[PDB]
C-alpha cells in the first residue's frame, strides 16, 4: 500500500497539531504518548500498535489501539480502567504491553506513567512556611 | 503630584508654581540657599536679598560672576542678588504659610524640607542681527515647588563552647 507508520512519521515529523516546541526540548500532547516526547518510538498516532494512559476518578484509564480497526475511530481503542491496588494495575499494564508482542519496548514507560498518575492522586503535604533572609528579614 | 512623595500631606503644607517667567539659573541658586531652613529665617533672608543686605551664593551657575564680601558667610566669593527670583520665592513661601494656617500647623516650627526648581517649556522672541541672520532670544522659565514640615546567630560549636566557658569563669 501507500500508507504506513513510516510514512505518517515522515509527513508529521516536522510539524503536528500535537507538537510543542521550545528551546529546552520538544513535547507532544498526543493522548497515546506515554512520555510526551516527540519520537517515532513514542508517537502513538503514527504507530499501528500504541498505548496511552489517562487518569480516572480513582486509578488509571489505559487505551490501546486495535490493529483491525484502524479505519474505525469509534471502535479503535481498547479501554481498561484500573481502580484496584497499584500493584495489580502495574501487572496488567505490563502484561498488556509485553506478554503478546504489543509494544514490549513501552513496558517500562507505561508502568512509569501509571505510577505517576497514582502518585499524583495522593493527598498533598502542606508546604513549609517561607523564610525571609537578610534585608527582607530585617524589614 | 510633587516629587517628594515620602511626606504625608496631612502633616505638611505645600505650594506650587508653574511656567513662572523668571531666570531658571538664578532661581535654582536661591532655592538652594534656603533649602532646609526655617520658614521665618528664609523669609528674612529673601527680603534682605532684595535690599542687597544678604547675597545668594552662585555654586553651579557662576561663570564669570563678580565677587563680594557678603559671600564670605557661605564660604564662596561669587555671590549675587537675584531680586526677581527672591520675589517669586517669597510668594510661594507666603502661600505655603497660609496653607499651613488653614490646616492648623505651627508656623514657628515649620522648616523647608523640600524645595525644587525644574525647567518649563521655553518661550521665544526673535531679535535682528546683521550679516543676514536673525538671532533668537529664547527665554528660560521654571517650575517651583516646596513643602513645609514640622521640625522634629549561627555560631559554630567551637564558638558556642568558647562562650559557655568564658561565661562560667
Amino acid at each position: 500500500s501507500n500508507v504506513s507508520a513510516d510514512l505518517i512519521w515522515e509527513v508529521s515529523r516536522n510539524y503536528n497539531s500535537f507538537l510543542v516546541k521550545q528551546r529546552t526540548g520538544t513535547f507532544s500532547r498526543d493522548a497515546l504518548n506515554l512520555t510526551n516526547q516527540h519520537s517515532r518510538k513514542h508517537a502513538g498516532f503514527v504507530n499501528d500498535k500504541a498505548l496511552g494512559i489517562v487518569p480516572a476518578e480513582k486509578g488509571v484509564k489505559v487505551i490501546a489501539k486495535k490493529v483491525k480497526a484502524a479505519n474505525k475511530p469509534a471502535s479503535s481503542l481498547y479501554t481498561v480502567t484500573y481502580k484496584s491496588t497499584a500493584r495489580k494495575a502495574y501487572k496488567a499494564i505490563a502484561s498488556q504491553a509485553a506478554k503478546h508482542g504489543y509494544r514490549a519496548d513501552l513496558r517500562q514507560a507505561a508502568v512509569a506513567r501509571a505510577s505517576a498518575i497514582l502518585r499524583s492522586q495522593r493527598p498533598v503535604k502542606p508546604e513549609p512556611p517561607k523564610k525571609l533572609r537578610g534585608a527582607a528579614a530585617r524589614r | 503630584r510633587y516629587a517628594a512623595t515620602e511626606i504625608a500631606p496631612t502633616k505638611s503644607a505645600r505650594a506650587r508654581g508653574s511656567y513662572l517667567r523668571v531666570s531658571f539659573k538664578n532661581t535654582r541658586e536661591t532655592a538652594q540657599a534656603i533649602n532646609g531652613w526655617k520658614l521665618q529665617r528664609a523669609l528674612t533672608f529673601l527680603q534682605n536679598v532684595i535690599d542687597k543686605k544678604e547675597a545668594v551664593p552662585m555654586r553651579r551657575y557662576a561663570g564669570s560672576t563678580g565677587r563680594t564680601a557678603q559671600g564670605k558667610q557661605w564660604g564662596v566669593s561669587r555671590a549675587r542678588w537675584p531680586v526677581k527670583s527672591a520675589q517669586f520665592l517669597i510668594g510661594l513661601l507666603k502661600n505655603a504659610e497660609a496653607n499651613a494656617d488653614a490646616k492648623g500647623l505651627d508656623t514657628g516650627n515649620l522648616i523647608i524640607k523640600h524645595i525644587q526648581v525644574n525647567q518649563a517649556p521655553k518661550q521665544r522672541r526673535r531679535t535682528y542681527r546683521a550679516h543676514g541672520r536673525i538671532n533668537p532670544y529664547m527665554s528660560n522659565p521654571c517650575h517651583i515647588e516646596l513643602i513645609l514640615t514640622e521640625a522634629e546567630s549561627h555560631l559554630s560549636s567551637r564558638q558556642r563552647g568558647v562562650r559557655i566557658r568564658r561565661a562560667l569563669t
Binding site: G25, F27, R29, L34, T35, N36, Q37, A116, R119, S120 | -
Partner: protein, 127 residues
C-alpha cells in the same frame, strides 16, 4: 519531587557578558554584541587588554546546557494542560508560568503542579 536528577557539576566557562566596543562611550550604541568589521580595530585583531570576542570555545557542556542551578530545564507553561505535559519530567524539567497568565489561572497551575510534583520557577509572584 523537588530533587532533580543526578547530574555532573554545572560549570560556566564565562559568566560576564560580551559588551559591544565603544558602547560604554555612546548612548546610541547598545551593549548587545556586534562583531567589529574594521580592518584596524584592536578588538577584531585580538590585541591584549581589549574586549573579548565570543566564540564556540566558551560553549557549555552538553550535559549541563539549558539547566538552571537547581538542575532542571525551564518549560514555559500557559495553562493547566501545559503542566500535565510535565508529568513524566518531575526531575528533569521545571514549569515557568508565562507573564500574561492571570492570577486565578496561576493558582490552578500551582495547585496542579504541586499535585504532579513539578517545580514552578515563579510560584510566589502574585501571593
Amino acid at each position: 519531587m523537588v530533587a532533580a536528577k543526578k547530574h555532573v557539576p554545572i560549570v560556566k566557562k564565562r559568566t560576564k557578558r560580551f559588551m559591544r566596543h565603544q558602547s560604554d562611550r555612546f548612548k546610541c550604541l547598545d551593549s548587545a554584541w556586534r562583531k567589529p568589521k574594521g580592518i584596524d580595530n584592536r578588538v577584531r585583531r585580538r590585541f591584549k587588554g581589549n574586549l573579548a570576542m565570543p566564540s564556540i570555545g566558551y560553549g557549555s557542556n552538553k550535559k549541563t546546557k539549558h539547566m538552571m542551578p537547581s538542575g532542571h530545564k525551564a518549560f514555559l507553561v500557559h495553562n493547566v494542560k501545559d503542566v500535565e505535559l510535565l508529568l513524566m519530567h518531575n526531575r528533569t524539567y521545571a514549569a515557568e508560568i508565562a507573564h500574561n497568565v492571570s492570577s486565578r489561572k496561576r493558582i490552578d497551575i500551582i495547585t496542579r503542579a504541586k499535585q504532579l510534583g513539578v517545580k514552578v520557577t515563579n510560584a510566589k509572584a502574585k501571593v
